[PDB]
Design a binder for this molecule. Structure first.
Ligand SMILES: *[C@@H]1O[C@H](CO)[C@@H](O[C@@H]2O[C@H](CO)[C@@H](O)[C@H](O)[C@H]2NC(C)=O)[C@H](O)[C@H]1NC(C)=O
Ligand code: NAG
Ligand code: NAG
Lengths: 112, 49
């Protein structure tokens, strides 16, 4: 159900906003001056673009010196109720030279 | 007269940050709210080559 993220400052076409849209491991990434809808969902100056419970996915996102860094992990799990105890280490996926300020974010869901 | 820079910014640049924004800024106290004038000199100045 969970299929992307919005990152940026004003999130309202007055400036660039990092948009990630994903279907597990194929991805579109863009940073353009997007005008979103008021309730963001995926229906079941454009200066950068890039393209690539049973389960748990983990990520770390950090934005340093004009580069955006992503780390991840995938694993199956047994604790339906909550975030599981035990030890695991994420590994880097990508490092993007996007040159953008970020102070807000939001998750994107696939809806009917 | 085309080649361009922002004469002001309300926050200094982070290393390798970029900023396209066409805000007029407070060049003074008054919130000009889309007016250009005193308190609001629009920043995207250009060289005269
Ligand atoms: C990154 O974007 C934020 C806005 O989301 C900027 O923060 C504002 O900065 C001004 C001063 O220039 C303050 O008066 C506001 O109160 C700040 N707002 C927030 C939400 O913190 C921030 O300055 C930008 N960073 C850079 C380096 O330009
Ligand atoms: C992922 O979604 C995009 C449309 O948003 C599509 O172009 C792409 O082919 C899809 N890939 C997969 C693996 O479904
Ligand atoms: C890019 O900026 C110009 C003004 O410099 C503006 O006219 C144009 O519509 C912007 N492009 C997008 C995709 O918003």
């Amino acid at each position: 159900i969970i299929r992307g993220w919005i990152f940026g400052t004003t999130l309202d076409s007055k400036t660039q906003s990092l948009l990630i849209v994903n279907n597990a491991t194929n991805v579109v990434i863009k940073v353009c001056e997007f005008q979103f809808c008021n309730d963001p969902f995926l229906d079941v100056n454009c200066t950068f673009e890039y393209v690539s419970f049973k389960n748990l996915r983990e990520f770390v996102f950090k934005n340093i010196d004009g580069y955006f860094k992503i780390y991840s992990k995938h694993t199956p799990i047994n604790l339906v109720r909550d975030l599981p105890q035990g030890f695991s280490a994420l590994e880097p996926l990508v490092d993007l030279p996007i040159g953008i300020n970020i102070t807000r974010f939001q998750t994107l869901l696939a809806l009917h | 007269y085309n080649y361009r820079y922002r004469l002001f910014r309300k926050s200094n640049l982070k290393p390798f940050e970029r900023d396209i924004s066409t805000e007029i800024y407070q060049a003074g106290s008054k919130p000009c709210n889309g007016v250009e004038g005193f308190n609001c000199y629009f920043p995207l100045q250009s060289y005269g080559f």
